[PDB]
């Protein structure tokens, strides 16, 4: 069907001010 | 991207990553079409069957990236969104017809060697280039295999992947699926008999399908990764939003909103 | 608009080709 689904979270933390 | 290869640095300077703030996860690809406007697939933002409905405050766009997971200090730019615009007649109920959305950035991004906009086709570029057998290029950080995407480093790449795929004739596209396809969609991929393979896959949605004009040497975005049944299955093809057919709506939104 | 759209800083603007773009141009027959 539509293309994230299995999204874990192994990402480096981005700079605080963007959250 | 299934059966693609690692992109070169600066190869797709218009590639954008849509990134969720909490949890921090990659949602979709997208593309930079000017200093303040990003183009993506509408289902990246709104898809009620999966209870997906993001507001601009949920999202960040990250521009100039190469590595999927690293914060690329001094190279990538992160921007917040001012407004999201979904096509009013996006059909999420049946076939993802008119799967397109524009996102206006809070502030202009400055261009650089890694950040540069792609062109949008005019009637004559679309006419000369959107022909069966002509190849386009798809890029994204999505799954490398249909069964295997989850994260870590299973079927999820370390850097941006690229694959070049032929446009397929509308008859062959229609006869490969039970989904009703419209004039706002086209499909691409290799036929079972061609020997080469390749496809977009989960996590590549919203990303650009681009072609390089032989007349003026510029890259044009002809499609947006929209849907498919599996990834790289023989006799199946990826479907893409037809950007030129929805260009009047794009122009309307940018002219009316900045 | 987009006066300079689609010309890449590290490739077209330097007259360098990426590794597979010839495959695209070779299909535009």
CSV table of C-alpha atoms in Angstrom, one decimal:
chain,number,residue,atom,x,y,z
A,1,UNK,CA,0.0,0.0,0.0
A,2,UNK,CA,1.5,3.4,0.9
A,3,UNK,CA,5.3,3.3,1.3
A,4,UNK,CA,8.0,4.3,7.6
A,5,UNK,CA,6.1,1.5,9.4
A,6,UNK,CA,9.1,-0.2,11.2
A,7,UNK,CA,10.8,2.8,12.6
A,8,UNK,CA,13.2,2.1,15.5
A,9,UNK,CA,15.2,5.1,16.8
A,10,UNK,CA,18.9,4.5,16.3
A,11,UNK,CA,19.4,8.2,15.4
A,12,UNK,CA,21.9,10.5,17.0
A,13,UNK,CA,20.2,13.2,19.1
A,14,UNK,CA,19.8,16.4,17.2
A,15,UNK,CA,20.6,19.7,19.0
A,16,UNK,CA,18.2,20.6,21.8
A,17,UNK,CA,16.9,23.8,20.3
A,18,UNK,CA,15.1,22.0,17.5
A,19,UNK,CA,12.8,20.1,19.8
B,1,UNK,CA,15.7,1.5,-1.9
B,2,UNK,CA,16.1,-2.1,-2.9
B,3,UNK,CA,19.1,-3.1,-5.1
B,4,UNK,CA,20.4,0.5,-5.3
B,5,UNK,CA,23.9,1.7,-4.4
B,6,UNK,CA,25.3,4.4,-2.0
B,7,UNK,CA,24.8,7.9,-3.4
B,8,UNK,CA,27.8,10.1,-4.0
B,9,UNK,CA,28.2,13.2,-1.7
B,10,UNK,CA,26.2,16.1,-3.3
B,11,UNK,CA,24.5,13.8,-5.8
B,12,UNK,CA,20.9,14.8,-4.8
B,13,UNK,CA,21.2,18.1,-3.0
B,14,UNK,CA,17.4,18.5,-3.1
B,15,UNK,CA,16.8,15.4,-1.0
B,16,UNK,CA,15.1,16.2,2.3
B,17,UNK,CA,14.4,13.9,5.3
B,18,UNK,CA,11.1,14.3,7.2
B,19,UNK,CA,11.8,13.7,10.8
B,20,UNK,CA,9.5,13.2,13.8
B,21,UNK,CA,10.4,15.1,17.0
B,22,UNK,CA,9.1,12.6,19.5
B,23,UNK,CA,9.9,9.7,19.1
B,24,UNK,CA,12.8,10.9,16.9
B,25,UNK,CA,12.2,8.8,13.8
B,26,UNK,CA,12.5,9.1,10.0
B,27,UNK,CA,9.0,9.5,8.5
B,28,UNK,CA,9.6,10.0,4.8
B,29,UNK,CA,11.8,11.5,2.1
B,30,UNK,CA,10.9,14.9,0.6
B,31,UNK,CA,12.5,17.4,-1.9
B,32,UNK,CA,13.6,21.0,-1.8
B,33,UNK,CA,12.0,23.0,-4.7
B,34,UNK,CA,13.0,26.6,-3.5
B,35,UNK,CA,14.6,28.2,-0.4
B,36,UNK,CA,11.3,27.8,1.6
B,37,UNK,CA,9.1,25.1,0.0
B,38,UNK,CA,9.4,21.3,0.4
B,39,UNK,CA,7.4,18.8,-1.7
B,40,UNK,CA,6.4,15.4,-0.3
B,41,UNK,CA,3.6,12.7,-0.6
B,42,UNK,CA,0.4,13.6,1.3
B,43,UNK,CA,0.3,10.2,2.9
B,44,UNK,CA,3.5,11.0,4.8
B,45,UNK,CA,1.3,13.5,6.7
B,46,UNK,CA,-2.2,12.2,6.6
B,47,UNK,CA,-3.3,8.6,6.4
B,48,UNK,CA,-6.3,7.8,8.7
B,49,UNK,CA,-6.2,4.0,8.2
B,50,UNK,CA,-3.0,4.0,10.1
B,51,UNK,CA,-4.1,6.8,12.4
B,52,UNK,CA,-1.5,9.1,10.9
B,53,UNK,CA,-2.3,12.9,10.9
B,54,UNK,CA,0.7,15.1,11.6
B,55,UNK,CA,0.6,18.8,12.3
B,56,UNK,CA,3.6,21.1,11.4
B,57,UNK,CA,4.5,21.2,15.1
B,58,UNK,CA,5.2,17.5,15.1
B,59,UNK,CA,7.8,17.6,12.3
B,60,UNK,CA,11.3,18.8,11.3
B,61,UNK,CA,12.8,18.7,7.9
B,62,UNK,CA,16.6,17.9,7.7
B,63,UNK,CA,18.2,19.2,4.5
B,64,UNK,CA,21.8,18.4,3.1
B,65,UNK,CA,22.1,14.9,4.6
B,66,UNK,CA,23.9,11.8,3.5
B,67,UNK,CA,24.1,9.5,6.6
B,68,UNK,CA,20.7,8.2,7.7
B,69,UNK,CA,21.3,8.4,11.5
B,70,UNK,CA,24.1,10.9,12.2
B,71,UNK,CA,23.5,14.5,13.1
B,72,UNK,CA,25.8,15.9,10.3
B,73,UNK,CA,27.2,18.9,12.1
B,74,UNK,CA,28.1,21.8,9.9
B,75,UNK,CA,26.6,20.1,6.8
B,76,UNK,CA,22.9,19.5,7.4
B,77,UNK,CA,20.3,22.2,8.1
B,78,UNK,CA,17.2,21.5,10.3
B,79,UNK,CA,14.1,23.6,9.8
B,80,UNK,CA,10.8,23.8,11.4
B,81,UNK,CA,7.6,24.2,9.5
B,82,UNK,CA,5.3,27.1,9.2
B,83,UNK,CA,2.4,25.4,7.3
B,84,UNK,CA,1.5,22.2,5.5
B,85,UNK,CA,-0.8,22.1,2.5
B,86,UNK,CA,-2.3,18.7,1.5
B,87,UNK,CA,-4.0,18.5,-2.0
B,88,UNK,CA,-7.8,19.1,-1.3
B,89,UNK,CA,-8.7,16.1,-3.4
B,90,UNK,CA,-6.0,13.7,-2.1
B,91,UNK,CA,-7.8,10.3,-2.1
B,92,UNK,CA,-6.6,8.4,1.0
B,93,UNK,CA,-9.8,6.3,1.0
B,94,UNK,CA,-9.2,4.3,-2.1
B,95,UNK,CA,-6.0,4.6,-4.2
B,96,UNK,CA,-3.8,7.5,-2.9
B,97,UNK,CA,-4.9,9.6,-6.0
B,98,UNK,CA,-3.3,13.1,-5.9
B,99,UNK,CA,-0.8,12.0,-3.2
B,100,UNK,CA,1.0,15.4,-2.9
B,101,UNK,CA,1.7,17.9,-0.1
B,102,UNK,CA,3.6,21.2,0.1
B,103,UNK,CA,5.4,22.3,3.4
B,104,UNK,CA,6.4,25.9,3.9
B,105,UNK,CA,9.5,26.4,6.0
B,106,UNK,CA,9.6,28.9,8.8
B,107,UNK,CA,12.7,30.6,7.4
B,108,UNK,CA,14.6,30.3,4.1
B,109,UNK,CA,17.5,27.8,4.0
B,110,UNK,CA,20.7,29.0,2.5
B,111,UNK,CA,22.0,26.9,-0.3
B,112,UNK,CA,25.4,25.3,-0.3
B,113,UNK,CA,27.2,22.4,-2.1
B,114,UNK,CA,25.0,19.9,-0.3
B,115,UNK,CA,21.7,21.8,-0.5
B,116,UNK,CA,20.2,23.0,-3.8
B,117,UNK,CA,16.6,22.9,-5.2
B,118,UNK,CA,15.4,20.6,-8.0
B,119,UNK,CA,13.4,22.0,-10.9
B,120,UNK,CA,9.7,21.4,-11.5
B,121,UNK,CA,8.8,20.3,-15.0
B,122,UNK,CA,7.0,22.4,-17.6
B,123,UNK,CA,4.6,20.9,-20.2
B,124,UNK,CA,7.3,20.5,-22.8
B,125,UNK,CA,9.9,18.8,-20.4
B,126,UNK,CA,7.2,16.4,-19.2
B,127,UNK,CA,6.2,15.7,-22.8
B,128,UNK,CA,9.7,14.8,-24.0
B,129,UNK,CA,10.8,12.9,-21.0
B,130,UNK,CA,7.9,11.0,-19.5
B,131,UNK,CA,8.1,8.2,-22.0
B,132,UNK,CA,8.2,4.4,-21.4
B,133,UNK,CA,11.7,3.0,-21.3
B,134,UNK,CA,13.2,6.4,-20.3
B,135,UNK,CA,15.0,6.2,-17.0
B,136,UNK,CA,14.6,8.3,-13.9
B,137,UNK,CA,16.4,8.1,-10.5
B,138,UNK,CA,14.9,7.5,-7.1
B,139,UNK,CA,16.7,8.3,-3.8
B,140,UNK,CA,15.9,7.6,-0.1
B,141,UNK,CA,17.0,6.2,3.3
B,142,UNK,CA,14.3,3.5,3.3
B,143,UNK,CA,14.5,-0.2,3.6
B,144,UNK,CA,16.9,-2.3,1.6
B,145,UNK,CA,14.7,-5.3,1.6
B,146,UNK,CA,10.9,-5.9,1.8
B,147,UNK,CA,11.4,-8.2,4.8
B,148,UNK,CA,14.2,-6.8,7.0
B,149,UNK,CA,13.5,-3.1,7.6
B,150,UNK,CA,13.2,-2.3,11.3
B,151,UNK,CA,16.2,-0.1,12.0
B,152,UNK,CA,19.7,-0.7,13.4
B,153,UNK,CA,21.5,-2.0,10.4
B,154,UNK,CA,19.2,-4.8,9.2
B,155,UNK,CA,17.7,-3.8,5.9
B,156,UNK,CA,18.2,-0.1,6.7
B,157,UNK,CA,21.1,1.7,4.9
B,158,UNK,CA,23.9,3.8,6.5
B,159,UNK,CA,23.8,6.5,3.8
B,160,UNK,CA,21.4,7.7,1.1
B,161,UNK,CA,20.8,5.1,-1.6
B,162,UNK,CA,20.1,5.7,-5.3
B,163,UNK,CA,18.6,3.5,-8.0
B,164,UNK,CA,17.8,4.3,-11.7
B,165,UNK,CA,14.5,2.8,-13.0
B,166,UNK,CA,12.7,2.8,-16.4
B,167,UNK,CA,9.2,4.3,-16.8
B,168,UNK,CA,6.7,1.5,-17.7
B,169,UNK,CA,3.8,1.7,-20.2
B,170,UNK,CA,0.4,2.5,-18.6
B,171,UNK,CA,-1.2,-0.9,-19.8
B,172,UNK,CA,1.5,-2.9,-18.0
B,173,UNK,CA,1.1,-0.7,-14.9
B,174,UNK,CA,-2.7,-1.2,-14.8
B,175,UNK,CA,-2.4,-5.0,-15.4
B,176,UNK,CA,0.0,-5.6,-12.5
B,177,UNK,CA,-2.4,-4.4,-9.7
B,178,UNK,CA,-6.0,-4.6,-8.6
B,179,UNK,CA,-5.8,-1.0,-7.4
B,180,UNK,CA,-7.5,1.5,-9.7
B,181,UNK,CA,-4.7,3.7,-11.1
B,182,UNK,CA,-5.4,7.3,-12.4
B,183,UNK,CA,-3.8,9.9,-14.7
B,184,UNK,CA,-2.1,11.4,-11.6
B,185,UNK,CA,0.2,8.4,-11.2
B,186,UNK,CA,2.8,6.6,-13.2
B,187,UNK,CA,4.7,3.4,-12.5
B,188,UNK,CA,8.4,2.5,-12.9
B,189,UNK,CA,10.6,-0.5,-12.7
B,190,UNK,CA,12.2,-3.3,-14.6
B,191,UNK,CA,9.9,-6.0,-16.2
B,192,UNK,CA,10.7,-9.7,-15.1
B,193,UNK,CA,12.4,-10.4,-18.3
B,194,UNK,CA,14.9,-7.5,-18.1
B,195,UNK,CA,17.4,-9.0,-15.7
B,196,UNK,CA,18.0,-5.7,-13.7
B,197,UNK,CA,16.0,-5.1,-10.6
B,198,UNK,CA,15.5,-2.2,-8.2
B,199,UNK,CA,12.6,-0.4,-6.4
B,200,UNK,CA,11.8,2.1,-3.7
B,201,UNK,CA,10.5,0.5,-0.5
B,202,UNK,CA,9.1,1.3,3.0
B,203,UNK,CA,10.6,4.7,4.3
B,204,UNK,CA,11.3,6.0,0.8
B,205,UNK,CA,7.8,7.6,0.4
B,206,UNK,CA,7.7,11.3,-0.4
B,207,UNK,CA,11.1,11.1,-2.0
B,208,UNK,CA,11.9,12.5,-5.6
B,209,UNK,CA,11.8,10.6,-8.9
B,210,UNK,CA,14.0,12.9,-11.1
B,211,UNK,CA,15.2,13.0,-14.6
B,212,UNK,CA,18.0,15.0,-16.2
B,213,UNK,CA,17.0,16.9,-19.3
B,214,UNK,CA,19.2,16.3,-22.3
B,215,UNK,CA,18.3,19.8,-23.6
B,216,UNK,CA,19.5,22.1,-20.8
B,217,UNK,CA,21.3,19.7,-18.4
B,218,UNK,CA,19.1,20.4,-15.4
B,219,UNK,CA,17.4,17.8,-13.1
B,220,UNK,CA,13.6,17.8,-13.1
B,221,UNK,CA,11.4,16.1,-10.5
B,222,UNK,CA,8.9,14.1,-12.4
B,223,UNK,CA,7.4,11.9,-9.6
B,224,UNK,CA,7.0,11.5,-5.8
B,225,UNK,CA,7.4,7.9,-4.3
B,226,UNK,CA,3.8,7.0,-3.4
B,227,UNK,CA,2.9,3.3,-3.2
B,228,UNK,CA,3.7,-0.2,-4.2
B,229,UNK,CA,2.8,-3.8,-3.3
B,230,UNK,CA,5.9,-5.3,-1.7
B,231,UNK,CA,9.3,-4.0,-2.8
B,232,UNK,CA,11.1,-5.3,-5.9
B,233,UNK,CA,8.7,-8.2,-6.6
B,234,UNK,CA,8.7,-9.6,-10.1
B,235,UNK,CA,5.8,-8.4,-12.1
B,236,UNK,CA,5.0,-5.5,-9.7
B,237,UNK,CA,6.1,-1.8,-10.1
B,238,UNK,CA,6.5,1.2,-7.9
B,239,UNK,CA,3.9,4.0,-8.3
B,240,UNK,CA,4.7,7.6,-8.2
B,241,UNK,CA,2.6,10.8,-8.0
B,242,UNK,CA,2.7,12.6,-11.5
B,243,UNK,CA,4.1,16.0,-10.5
B,244,UNK,CA,3.4,17.8,-13.8
B,245,UNK,CA,-0.3,16.9,-13.7
B,246,UNK,CA,-0.6,18.5,-10.3
B,247,UNK,CA,1.6,21.5,-11.0
B,248,UNK,CA,-1.2,24.0,-11.2
B,249,UNK,CA,-2.1,23.2,-7.6
B,250,UNK,CA,1.6,23.7,-6.6
B,251,UNK,CA,1.7,27.1,-8.4
B,252,UNK,CA,-1.6,28.1,-6.8
B,253,UNK,CA,-0.3,27.4,-3.3
B,254,UNK,CA,3.1,29.1,-3.7
B,255,UNK,CA,1.5,32.1,-5.4
B,256,UNK,CA,-1.2,32.5,-2.7
B,257,UNK,CA,1.0,31.7,0.3
B,258,UNK,CA,4.6,33.0,-0.3
C,1,UNK,CA,10.7,30.0,-10.7
C,2,UNK,CA,14.1,28.7,-9.5
C,3,UNK,CA,16.6,30.3,-11.8
C,4,UNK,CA,19.4,28.0,-10.8
C,5,UNK,CA,17.3,24.9,-10.1
C,6,UNK,CA,18.5,21.4,-11.0
C,7,UNK,CA,22.2,22.4,-11.5
C,8,UNK,CA,24.3,20.6,-8.7
C,9,UNK,CA,27.2,22.6,-7.1
C,10,UNK,CA,29.5,19.5,-7.1
C,11,UNK,CA,28.6,18.1,-10.6
C,12,UNK,CA,26.9,20.3,-13.3
C,13,UNK,CA,28.4,23.6,-12.1
C,14,UNK,CA,31.9,22.0,-12.2
C,15,UNK,CA,31.3,20.0,-15.3
C,16,UNK,CA,31.7,16.7,-13.4
C,17,UNK,CA,29.3,13.7,-14.1
C,18,UNK,CA,28.2,11.4,-11.4
C,19,UNK,CA,28.7,7.7,-11.7
C,20,UNK,CA,25.5,6.6,-13.3
C,21,UNK,CA,23.9,9.6,-14.9
C,22,UNK,CA,25.0,8.4,-18.4
C,23,UNK,CA,22.6,5.4,-17.9
C,24,UNK,CA,19.8,7.9,-17.8
C,25,UNK,CA,21.0,9.9,-20.8
C,26,UNK,CA,21.6,6.8,-22.8
C,27,UNK,CA,17.9,5.8,-22.3
C,28,UNK,CA,16.5,9.0,-23.8
C,29,UNK,CA,16.2,7.7,-27.3
